Amino acid sequence: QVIQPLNGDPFIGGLETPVTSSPLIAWYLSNLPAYRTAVNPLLRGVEVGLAHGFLLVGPFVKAGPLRNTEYAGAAGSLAAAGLVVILSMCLTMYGIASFKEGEPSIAPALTLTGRKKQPDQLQSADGWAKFTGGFFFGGVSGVTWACFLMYVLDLPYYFK
Amino acid sequence: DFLVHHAIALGLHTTTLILVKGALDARGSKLMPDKKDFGYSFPCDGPGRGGTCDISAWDAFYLAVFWMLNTIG
Amino acid sequence: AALYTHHQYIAGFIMTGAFAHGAIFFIRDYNPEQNEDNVLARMLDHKEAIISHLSWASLFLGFHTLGLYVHND
Amino acid sequence: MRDFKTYLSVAPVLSTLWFGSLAGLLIEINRFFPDALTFPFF
Amino acid sequence: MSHSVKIYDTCIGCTQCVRACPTDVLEMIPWDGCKAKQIASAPRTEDCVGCKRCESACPTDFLSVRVYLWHETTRSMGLGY
Amino acid sequence: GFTPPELDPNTPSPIFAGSTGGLLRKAQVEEFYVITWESPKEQIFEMPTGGAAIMREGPNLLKLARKEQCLALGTRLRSKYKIKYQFYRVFPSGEVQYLHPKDGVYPEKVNPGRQGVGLNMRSIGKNVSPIEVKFTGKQPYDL
Amino acid sequence: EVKILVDRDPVKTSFEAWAKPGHFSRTIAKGPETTTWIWNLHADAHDFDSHTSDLEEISRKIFSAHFGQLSIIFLWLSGMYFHGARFSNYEAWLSDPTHIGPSAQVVWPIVGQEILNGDVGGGFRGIQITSGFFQIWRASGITSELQLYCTAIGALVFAALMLFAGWFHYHKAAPKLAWFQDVESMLNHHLAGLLGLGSLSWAGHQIHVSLPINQFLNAGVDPKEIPLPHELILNRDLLAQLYPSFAEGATPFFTLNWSKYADFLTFRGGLDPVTGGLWLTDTAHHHLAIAILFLIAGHMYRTNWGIGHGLKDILEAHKGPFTGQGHKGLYEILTTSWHAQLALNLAMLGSLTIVVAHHMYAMPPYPYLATDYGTQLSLFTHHMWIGGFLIVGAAAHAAIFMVRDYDPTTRYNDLLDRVLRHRDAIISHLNWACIFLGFHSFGLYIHNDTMSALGRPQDMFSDTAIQLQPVFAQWIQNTHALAPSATAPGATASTSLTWGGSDLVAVGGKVALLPIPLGTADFLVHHIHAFTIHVTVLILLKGVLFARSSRLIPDKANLGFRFPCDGPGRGGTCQVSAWDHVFLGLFWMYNSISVVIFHFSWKMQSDVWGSISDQGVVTHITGGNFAQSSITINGWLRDFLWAQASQVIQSYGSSLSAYGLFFLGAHFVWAFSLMFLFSGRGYWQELIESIVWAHNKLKVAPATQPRALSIVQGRAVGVTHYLLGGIATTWAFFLARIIAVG
Amino acid sequence: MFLISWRGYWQELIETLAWAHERTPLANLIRWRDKPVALSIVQARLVGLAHFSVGYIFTYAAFLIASTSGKFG
Ligand code: CLA
Ligand code: CLA
Ligand code: CLA
Ligand code: CLA
Ligand code: CLA
Ligand code: CLA
Ligand SMILES: CC1=C(/C=C/C(C)=C/C=C/C(C)=C/C=C/C=C(C)/C=C/C=C(C)/C=C/C2=C(C)CCCC2(C)C)C(C)(C)CCC1
Numbered sequence A: 001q002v003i004q005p006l007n008g009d010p011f012i013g014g015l016e017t018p019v020t021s022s023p024l025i026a027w028y029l030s031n032l033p034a035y036r037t038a039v040n041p042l043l044r045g046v047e048v049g050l051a052h053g054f055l056l057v058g059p060f061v062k063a064g065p066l067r068n069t070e071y072a073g074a075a076g077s078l079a080a081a082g083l084v085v086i087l088s089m090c091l092t093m094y095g096i097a098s099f100k101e102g103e104p105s106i107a108p109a110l111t112l113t114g115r116k117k118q119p120d121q122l123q124s125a126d127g128w129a130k131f132t133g134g135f136f137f138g139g140v141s142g143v144t145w146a147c148f149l150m151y152v153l154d155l156p157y158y159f160k
Numbered sequence B: 001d002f003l004v005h006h007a008i009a010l011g012l013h014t015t016t017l018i019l020v021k022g023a024l025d026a027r028g029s030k031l032m033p034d035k036k037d038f039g040y041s042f043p044c045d046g047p048g049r050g051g052t053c054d055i056s057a058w059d060a061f062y063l064a065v066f067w068m069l070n071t072i073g
Numbered sequence C: 001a002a003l004y005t006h007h008q009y010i011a012g013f014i015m016t017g018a019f020a021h022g023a024i025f026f027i028r029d030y031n032p033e034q035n036e037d038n039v040l041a042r043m044l045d046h047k048e049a050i051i052s053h054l055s056w057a058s059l060f061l062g063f064h065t066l067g068l069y070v071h072n073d
Numbered sequence D: 001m002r003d004f005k006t007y008l009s010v011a012p013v014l015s016t017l018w019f020g021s022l023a024g025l026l027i028e029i030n031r032f033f034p035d036a037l038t039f040p041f042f
Numbered sequence E: 001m002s003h004s005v006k007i008y009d010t011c012i013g014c015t016q017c018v019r020a021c022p023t024d025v026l027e028m029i030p031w032d033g034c035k036a037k038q039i040a041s042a043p044r045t046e047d048c049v050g051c052k053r054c055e056s057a058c059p060t061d062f063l064s065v066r067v068y069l070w071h072e073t074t075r076s077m078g079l080g081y
Numbered sequence F: 001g002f003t004p005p006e007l008d009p010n011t012p013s014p015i016f017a018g019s020t021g022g023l024l025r026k027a028q029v030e031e032f033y034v035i036t037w038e039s040p041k042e043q044i045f046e047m048p049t050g051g052a053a054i055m056r057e058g059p060n061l062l063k064l065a066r067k068e069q070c071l072a073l074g075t076r077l078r079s080k081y082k083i084k085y086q087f088y089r090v091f092p093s094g095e096v097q098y099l100h101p102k103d104g105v106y107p108e109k110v111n112p113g114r115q116g117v118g119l120n121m122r123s124i125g126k127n128v129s130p131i132e133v134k135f136t137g138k139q140p141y142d143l
Numbered sequence G: 001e002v003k004i005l006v007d008r009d010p011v012k013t014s015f016e017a018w019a020k021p022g023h024f025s026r027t028i029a030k031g032p033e034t035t036t037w038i039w040n041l042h043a044d045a046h047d048f049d050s051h052t053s054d055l056e057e058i059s060r061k062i063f064s065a066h067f068g069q070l071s072i073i074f075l076w077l078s079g080m081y082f083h084g085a086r087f088s089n090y091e092a093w094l095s096d097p098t099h100i101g102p103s104a105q106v107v108w109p110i111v112g113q114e115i116l117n118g119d120v121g122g123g124f125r126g127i128q129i130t131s132g133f134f135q136i137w138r139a140s141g142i143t144s145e146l147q148l149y150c151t152a153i154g155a156l157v158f159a160a161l162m163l164f165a166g167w168f169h170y171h172k173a174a175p176k177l178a179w180f181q182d183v184e185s186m187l188n189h190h191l192a193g194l195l196g197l198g199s200l201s202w203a204g205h206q207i208h209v210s211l212p213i214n215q216f217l218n219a220g221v222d223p224k225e226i227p228l229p230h231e232l233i234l235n236r237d238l239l240a241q242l243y244p245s246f247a248e249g250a251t252p253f254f255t256l257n258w259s260k261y262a263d264f265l266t267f268r269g270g271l272d273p274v275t276g277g278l279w280l281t282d283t284a285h286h287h288l289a290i291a292i293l294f295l296i297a298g299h300m301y302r303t304n305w306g307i308g309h310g311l312k313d314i315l316e317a318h319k320g321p322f323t324g325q326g327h328k329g330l331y332e333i334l335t336t337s338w339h340a341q342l343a344l345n346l347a348m349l350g351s352l353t354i355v356v357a358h359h360m361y362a363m364p365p366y367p368y369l370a371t372d373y374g375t376q377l378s379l380f381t382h383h384m385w386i387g388g389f390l391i392v393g394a395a396a397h398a399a400i401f402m403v404r405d406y407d408p409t410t411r412y413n414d415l416l417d418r419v420l421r422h423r424d425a426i427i428s429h430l431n432w433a434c435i436f437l438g439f440h441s442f443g444l445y446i447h448n449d450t451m452s453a454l455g456r457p458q459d460m461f462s463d464t465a466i467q468l469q470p471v472f473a474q475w476i477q478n479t480h481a482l483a484p485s486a487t488a489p490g491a492t493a494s495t496s497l498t499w500g501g502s503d504l505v506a507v508g509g510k511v512a513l514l515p516i517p518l519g520t521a522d523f524l525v526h527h528i529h530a531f532t533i534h535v536t537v538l539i540l541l542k543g544v545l546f547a548r549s550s551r552l553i554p555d556k557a558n559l560g561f562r563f564p565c566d567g568p569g570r571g572g573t574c575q576v577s578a579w580d581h582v583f584l585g586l587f588w589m590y591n592s593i594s595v596v597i598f599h600f601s602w603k604m605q606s607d608v609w610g611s612i613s614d615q616g617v618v619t620h621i622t623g624g625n626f627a628q629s630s631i632t633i634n635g636w637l638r639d640f641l642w643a644q645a646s647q648v649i650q651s652y653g654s655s656l657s658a659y660g661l662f663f664l665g666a667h668f669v670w671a672f673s674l675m676f677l678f679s680g681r682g683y684w685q686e687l688i689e690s691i692v693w694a695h696n697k698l699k700v701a702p703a704t705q706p707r708a709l710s711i712v713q714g715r716a717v718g719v720t721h722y723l724l725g726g727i728a729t730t731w732a733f734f735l736a737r738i739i740a741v742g
Numbered sequence H: 001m002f003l004i005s006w007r008g009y010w011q012e013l014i015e016t017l018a019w020a021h022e023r024t025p026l027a028n029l030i031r032w033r034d035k036p037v038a039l040s041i042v043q044a045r046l047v048g049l050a051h052f053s054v055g056y057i058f059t060y061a062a063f064l065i066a067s068t069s070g071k072f073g
């Protein structure tokens, strides 16, 4: 018996599988910033923005229309920053669409074992707003750091 | 020119047939005597009575748009 | 060429809309009690003859035009 | 034999016989009077 | 905010409209206008999906049960999610 | 005076190995349905959410997401296994609404005490034309 | 226990059931009340599972229908052999295969159709055939029309025997149910007696007849002066002159000195330079080895004697932790359901047909087959279409099994239950795979088209641009090119000429096969192929899995396998049945096979087919434009459709004008299908009401009340006419293009 | 595909897509406010007709202008 019902419940639309409920996979998912409920959403947003803005620079620089010119390092990186300016904007709209000022967090207040848990502040107006601001700051910081590493400090790289 | 003008007449007559049938059966027919109670645009009347797809006058307009496009083409 | 094609497609769409809005009038605004034995109610009285004669004209035109074209080909 | 004649009287078999006879007549007419565009007998 | 299911007086009394309902909208109530001494009724049209199985089994010349599609909810759109 | 049977939360559930067709977020933010029946023998039935389950002897309770699923399962139980079934609707607030037999008797057969809703005392062709109901909220079939 | 269980005279041979239409079921034998009954009479004619609930009568009807199909196939084969004997230029084609077009059909001189009798060569006027029967007959050693006449007479006799057997095994001596459920003996006999003994007999024919006759033909000997095939059997020295090992008899076989037979049993590989096909010695050794393998593979399953394997025990022995009880219960499912067997066999036969088409194009097994470009194109396209149709029918009948023959109360399988429990995960993952493949396969074409239209050719996904090279396929080609060096030292040459090297076979100034290059264009087309196949799989598997129930209709199995809808409720429940999933997947199979055959045609016309000059240069048909043009949709529209349609639109007034007429008619039928596909029944019924009034006015309305076609029948007519038109268009276009220039 | 393929297949596909989004880690954080459903039958007919008409007009306009501008006469 490797495939179990979802938390012993066969009438919930899901299953327990080694890809779903492995201890290593559960640990890795729990240590991600999006699942750090007790931490300030500003810090988790900063981390998420840093990672995503850092990874976004590469495709824009290497596959942009100016990838074979001198302006490959700057303009494509700028495009990555522009995407962050788009992405956070989308997040902001989500924060206005879903959560209201007067309502508390809508995150689940229980765990798998059924014990009482403080709900995550991310699923709230203030929490999502702080998360989006941290995402924007981390995104622009990560784009700047990627540009500094590849083209300002001139670290050796394979550049794909 | 004779053949293409007669094809043009065929297209005009067929599009008129579709549109006039929709307009005159809009209020009802033997299959759906109370079509007027269901408005201008409704999907169908279910699979009963043999099947009632494209029974509304809006669907007659939708079918006749294809024939109008073919005629103008 | 662009002007002719543009205005002919516009005219076809507008005629299709004319027939569609006539059907809309029949569903929504037509009053049988105020239109008894009119020239408008008598269309619904003999709608079968109109639709069948339109069907005959379209079928005859399509049959013979397609037959002549296929014969030539 | 009555059942076989009833089967021969059904729609596809009778249609096949009738249309085959008609097609044969038209083909023989087109062989003996080929390339007919007008009616010149009158 | 539900599909409108209406019962007319031409109802014979056959319960096929009720047996053909997958959401328990219709039921059979007593009546006196037919031999069967019963007529259909629609008290739970809030659960009506609009499948029109009820009027696909009505044997009259035209349907004594009529489902008019109307404003749609989560249980009228057949949404399990 | 028929009284609705109360829901028993401690009712055991059929033996099922888990499926992806079960409940979703709609069961949490909105209502979900619960069907209870009484199996006289431990047998195997087919779930409406795909797959097969093994009902246990005695009372059985199953939670589904739609009323149509509950009614389809109940019809299968009544036709194939001849089991009496009742299903309820449960809200996130904990409210339970006893749904299917509104008077303890199946809706197909006539039972006294039912009131007529949506009853029109005319033939279907005697409906009022839409032009006579224009600019009023009343529909021709509602009159 | 495995005996011959047969009941005598179960069904009386009479014409009473001929006189009554629709006798097989009850709702139809009552007589027609409307016109729809007629269509129903042609819809439930071969649905034996709905006529009766007894498996024995269903199985007997299946057996006799198979006999009738075999009789029809034998009749068709007799017709082809007769039309190759009379009304053919096979004897003329034998002398000059590289300049005389094969022809086996002549039209009669009526209404000016005699223009279709084209100058195919060899003093013959007739329709050029592309079925490749001439190559089969040359590979079989047939050098005279009398042999073809004898084969036609024998096939007529065999068709009569099949028809008599079909009548006998249903009306006189019908097998019992336990006779059909003896799957072990059936598998043993069909692996050892049908495939094994058939391969052994064909190897014997190739060794004793095809090899010496083909050696004489390739030696330049005139066909009428070649000794008759029986003369090489009665005279062993005549065969021994060509192959000296025949002087030793069968003693090297019985003494295990098989290496003495290395003159007519060779593992040579490659192609014959004289004929452009596979070596017939290679085919003889191949069929011998296949016969041995099938004969020792047919003594596996258990029967009346205790030795052997039990299929039930083999299935029950395989069960894992993930799958639980495993394959237990599948034997009872497969032995009591004809639809499951039909699904499995249809899938396997469609895949087999597809791999057959690929291996025939890659290795031509008949003499002068590769240099016949029309035959190659026709065979590849035809077997691609057959395979796609059978693969679609596999899911079509798997859905019927799930709706009708599936139940977990009895005949319960754990694997099928676990598949049905996580069907949402399978469908969603396949949906994501389809979206990802569609984007990263077709958006690349859109990107290339936009970059070329914007004047940015350096930004495309081309060979002279951003390169997407198939490194894995090129590595496989390189590995198979050097297979005779290290991995297969017993093979003289490689298994095909389509991998690499300096090898090139050209017969009669035409290229037979070349090392096929693989580049970015092949990469894009192959990923397009994968995307189309995955989408068709998604549609068919979704239909199979949700044929019983879903979150929308929990009681879809009660509605049936083939029903139109469940009304306009739940927002609309149109095409929820699995039959509609098959109807949708038919279009996607058509799309996938059309893209595949377009790829094959353009790639072989640009990089393989062509002509060889006396100096040594090679000039292809389209000049190798596939590498630079096929990467854009505009390239496919212009350099493939527009450029190669000039041979089918200009065929009027010549012998290929029938292809132009079929081009136009197929376009017409494809357009005609859209009327059924886009419309609905209610409008047509309301129009039929007015036509019925017009007929009733003149007392000419029929008693059978005219009714519009049903929703399912309307969809079926639409998809049938759609497939017919869209396939006949490609048929006419391919045939005219490859006959006019090839 | 808005004209040939119809609603139930797409609704049953959207149900599985909604299940996949509700059970995908790092994506259950983002939830829809409006429940995704398939296109309505009349809505899908209109969408298919709009795509059909746009294709008709744009294709013939491109062909006409390109033919009469690559050679003016
Ligand atoms: C569908 C596939 C597709 C692809 C792959 C490309 C690819 C390319 N195009 Mg084309 N293009 C397409 C379709 C496509 N195009 C279409 C439909 C159009 C409209 C006509 C165009 C029109 C177009 C234009 C107008 C231009 C391009 C250009 C480019 C480049 C992108 C530049 C950039 O800003 O984006 C990069 C964006 C990214 C953020 C990439 C995201 C992908 C990430 C890395 C996913 C990796 C997945 C990961 C492994 C998943 C698991 C995670 C793990 C942790 C578990 C690139 C070479 C530019 C150019 O000319 O250069 C050649 C440009 O100017 N394209
Ligand atoms: C290009 C293909 C095509 C064709 C040929 C037709 C043909 C026709 N349409 Mg359809 N239609 C089409 C596409 C097409 N439609 C599309 C895309 C739509 C949009 C959904 C519609 C929607 C539509 C509507 C809404 C209406 C029609 C109607 C008609 C009829 C018009 C009158 C006439 O021309 O009859 C001449 C007949 C023909 C051209 C068709 C027959 C072809 C030859 C003559 C067949 C002879 C048989 C031959 C021996 C083959 C043997 C068969 C077998 C043994 C092999 C005719 C049956 C109108 C109507 O019903 O009129 C009565 C009408 O109400 N059509
Ligand atoms: C070793 C002998 C043997 C052979 C050769 C076959 C061969 C065949 N069987 Mg199988 N079968 C066998 C044993 C055998 N069977 C046994 C013992 C059983 C019972 C367990 C079955 C059960 C069975 C069923 C239920 C069915 C078949 C079918 C078929 C045919 C499908 C393959 C095909 O058409 O290819 C083409 C193959 C040929 C034309 C090559 C020549 C084979 C000759 C003509 C057959 C003579 C074989 C026969 C068994 C022996 C004669 C009996 C005697 C009284 C005359 C094929 C003719 C299917 C079918 O098509 O039935 C009509 C089918 O429905 N078989
Ligand atoms: C996943 C694995 C698997 C795969 C890939 C296949 C694949 C194949 N099997 Mg199947 N099979 C399987 C599991 C599998 N099987 C199991 C577990 C069983 C035991 C129940 C069978 C039983 C079985 C039998 C008994 C036969 C096959 C045959 C075949 C081949 C069909 C040939 C065809 O295409 O028609 C081309 C034409 C023919 C040769 C086949 C003629 C039609 C056959 C005889 C009818 C099938 C009847 C079957 C016994 C159903 C009876 C129902 C009964 C309970 C009432 C096909 C390649 C056939 C084969 O061996 O061919 C060489 C065959 O005879 N299979
Ligand atoms: C290999 C053999 C095979 C066999 C034995 C079966 C067996 C069967 N099929 Mg399956 N099927 C197969 C392959 C096969 N199928 C394939 C390859 C497909 C994919 C297309 C399907 C898809 C399929 C569907 C979609 C359905 C079935 C169903 C059925 C059952 C009834 C068939 C019927 O009544 O039609 C009797 C015969 C006809 C209706 C003939 C129709 C005419 C065809 C479509 C035209 C072919 C065009 C022709 C080449 C053009 C010439 C022009 C013309 C003028 C002559 C029966 C169990 C039906 C079912 O079980 O219903 C519940 C059903 O719904 N099958
Ligand atoms: C010819 C046009 C056409 C197109 C483009 C599609 C598109 C699609 N089909 Mg449909 N379909 C069609 C005809 C078409 N179909 C027809 C004729 C039928 C009748 C049988 C169907 C029936 C049908 C079925 C039955 C199924 C589909 C499925 C699919 C989807 C899978 C492909 C995928 O997602 O890859 C990615 C998307 C595409 C390749 C579409 C083009 C997008 C390009 C590459 C990029 C556009 C650029 C970008 C978005 C920028 C936008 C600009 C901005 C201004 C908005 C996709 C939405 C399958 C599906 O649902 O699986 C997920 C499915 O099961 N289709
Ligand atoms: C010869 C000539 C002449 C004369 C002319 C004429 C006289 C013409 C006419 C014409 C016409 C006469 C036309 C018409 C047309 C029509 C149309 C186009 C129509 C349409 C319709 C519709 C669209 C409809 C609608 C509707 C409906 C549906 C129903 C309800 C109502 C309504 C009405 C709304 C003159 C001397 C001057 C000069 C010289 C030449």
Ligand code: SF4
Pocket (backbone or CB within 6 Å): B043, B044, B045, B046, B047, B051, B052, B053, B054, G564, G565, G566, G567, G568, G569, G572, G573, G574, G575, G680, G711, H041
């Ligand atoms: S298939 Fe026809 S009858 Fe059924 S829901 Fe769709 S339009 Fe209505």
Ligand code: SF4
Pocket (backbone or CB within 6 Å): E007, E010, E011, E012, E013, E014, E015, E016, E017, E018, E039, E040, E057, E058, E059, E060, E064, E065
């Ligand atoms: S509503 Fe229909 S099913 Fe019910 S009693 Fe009336 S006629 Fe019978």
Ligand code: SF4
Pocket (backbone or CB within 6 Å): E005, E020, E021, E022, E023, E024, E025, E026, E047, E048, E049, E050, E051, E052, E053, E054, E055, E067, G569
């Ligand atoms: S439409 Fe369907 S759910 Fe509504 S009353 Fe009729 S049968 Fe019941």
